[PDB]
Design a protein around this ligand. Structure first.
Ligand SMILES: Nc1ncnc2c1ncn2[C@@H]1O[C@H](COP(=O)(O)OP(=O)(O)O)[C@@H](O)[C@H]1O
Ligand SMILES: Nc1ncnc2c1ncn2[C@@H]1O[C@H](COP(=O)(O)OP(=O)(O)O)[C@@H](O)[C@H]1O
Ligand SMILES: [Mg+2]
Ligand SMILES: [Mg+2]
Lengths: 344, 344
């Protein structure tokens, strides 16, 4: 009867500490009538550690010092195993029935961890391989959004083989100034540059390319910053909207009608990229206002102060209840998948 | 100095026996001056077995009976481990320096296995998570191809939630007859149906949906069936073309010019979907002849009789040499990646 939730958290990421806090928040909200937690922390070097609920954090109550307890209790995965897929090197680890992965950084978000979890036959919360891979690659994501006739910022994408040939002038004639230079990998916020003059571009292009093999160059979008939370698998729902002021305001100070059409856009974007479980969608609401999609994010924050849970809160969905729904959604997909993976 | 090549093969697939033969062919061609093999077979139930080069097949020399030796020597993966990532449950397994995965079926081809290999920090041959996930999903693949202004067959895509509402008439007005009904998952060839009359459609739609949650309905493309092999990472090359007659003919009986523009299309398609290592591209060459892309396949066959190696053979690239290049390409990507995965 009780479901065992393997929480996998942290990771090699600038947002590592956000994942620690999220795990602690999730762990306090998990309905203890339905779920027992099992905890696997991933350190800043990518090493996996089992921990007990009680003792998994160092300096828990200090945001400047908070760290993972690197217990050194290692984990082995048995690919193609059907039970006890997760194993202690050295013990026994509780059977995991569903994984809630909140690993920030490339591997935790780009589909790679999701593919490990599939290979271990583990149900798991959030987008599968494809939705995660596509969303995380801002170039592919915008192309799939574009084809779906949703608006995204006009943009050009360079690799290192192709950046050598960049002509600023032609870029400015096509996209204008300022230009936002971004590495295509979504995680996170690093290597970005707002280029104001044609002359600051080379340096932006070069910084970005230290982070990914692909760098986007985007035209400016002028307008307000709205964020909307999406939940579900086949029939996704949308939360109320929140406006980023510059500091988030929930619900947003916009028309009921405008909210509805951003809600609808958030859902169509989510379907087009093949997301499941959860995403936060970030749009620009122009003066017209066309709605232009900035980002589809398949790993939102789950702290008490994070936007995604705040948006569900303001929509009548409580934090405990959010978490429970994410788990039911993971188990529903899994058992639907189960039936499908029957070839001859 | 010698590189250790972990060959992972078989899988839960109708094409399981093709993977056995491929592994045997690869193993005989592997340059023994540069590479030692390590063998991991995956059985029809998805279980992993280490085997010795000498004794990995049952009834090797009989195509009707050939099977994997289920040695029962299990494998554990240490995610985030940096050496000995692959481990015997029960021994020692040789350090693997590069993985050559030829696992047919969903998990081996759709990016999931590739994500496990990333999580284990293992370089590996063929497309990474995204290129595999995208190529394997025929719906997403055609949308990305479409956006890249390459021609694909006109098509509509249904899920079970949406198939209930299918109107044949509107489908026929838009796409014509016959209609090819396909589950969106690329592997492989199963659940396909050629629907000749409006009346055979419901049944096709229903069979397909037993295999995937998404089913494509495609207009007919009238024209010749050309296949072209692609190799490389950042600067992919194309082989000579082969024509499927109805039985493959290499090289194809087509103009030098026509060959060149199918070659160019095969490469652009490969870039657009984010493929690496290898793909076979299958097109239709119409009477006009526009070239229309049928399939981008990121896991071609590697038997002696498979098309992909035959195409390189006829282009001056030998089988041993193909295999060696695929490995150098895997190691090159890996070490480029290495530098990138440096966040703060
Ligand atoms: N094309 C653009 N036009 C206008 N503003 C942009 C554009 N791209 C990014 N921004 C601004 O950059 C800020 C951060 O960019 P964002 O895409 O959110 O990257 P990250 O989320 O990683 O910081 C956003 O708050 C938005 O104000
Ligand atoms: N839209 C289409 N128009 C014309 N022929 C098609 C179409 N789709 C499939 N075919 C035919 O179906 C055969 C097999 O389809 P294919 O896409 O190759 O599936 P699989 O490779 O899994 O058999 C091809 O040889 C081609 O002749
Ligand atoms: Mg954003
Ligand atoms: Mg084909």
């Amino acid at each position: 009867r009780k479901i065992r939730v393997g929480l996998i958290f942290g990771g090699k990421s600038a947002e590592h500490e956000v994942s620690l806090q999220s795990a602690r928040n999730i762990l306090d909200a998990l309905d203890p009538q339905r779920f027992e937690p099992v905890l696997i922390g991933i350190d800043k070097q990518g090493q996996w550690h089992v921990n007990d609920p009680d003792s998994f954090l160092l300096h828990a109550d200090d945001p400047a010092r908070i760290a993972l307890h690197r217990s050194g209790r290692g984990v082995a995965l048995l690919p193609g195993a059907q039970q006890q897929q997760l194993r202690p090197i050295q013990q026994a680890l509780a059977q995991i029935d569903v994984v809630f992965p909140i690993v920030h950084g490339t591997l935790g978000e780009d589909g790679s961890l999701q593919g490990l979890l599939r290979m271990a036959n583990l149900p798991f919360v959030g987008s599968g391989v494809l939705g995660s891979a596509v969303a995380m690659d801002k170039d592919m994501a915008k192309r799939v959004l574009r084809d779906a006739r949703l608006a995204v910022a006009p943009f050009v994408c360079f690799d290192r083989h192709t950046a050598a040939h960049a002509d600023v002038d032609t870029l400015i004639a096509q996209l204008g100034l300022p230009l936002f230079v971004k590495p295509a990998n979504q995680g996170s916020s690093v290597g970005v540059s707002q280029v104001r003059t044609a002359d600051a571009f080379a340096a932006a292009l070069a910084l970005a390319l230290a982070y990914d093999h692909k760098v986007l160059v985007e035209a400016a979008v002028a307008g307000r910053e709205i964020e909307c939370a999406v939940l579900g698998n086949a029939v996704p729902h949308a939360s109320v909207c929140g406006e980023v002021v510059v500091e988030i305001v929930i619900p947003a100070d916009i028309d009921a009608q405008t909210q509805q059409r951003i809600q609808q856009i958030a859902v169509q974007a989510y379907q087009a990229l093949g997301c499941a479980g959860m995403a936060r969608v970030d749009v620009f609401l122009c003066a017209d206002g066309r709605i232009v999609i900035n980002e589809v994010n398949t790993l939102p924050g789950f702290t008490r102060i994070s936007v995604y849970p705040k948006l569900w809160q303001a929509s009548g969905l409580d934090y405990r209840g959010l978490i429970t729904r994410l788990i039911e959604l993971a188990l529903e997909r899994h058992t639907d998948d189960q039936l499908l993976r029957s070839a001859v």
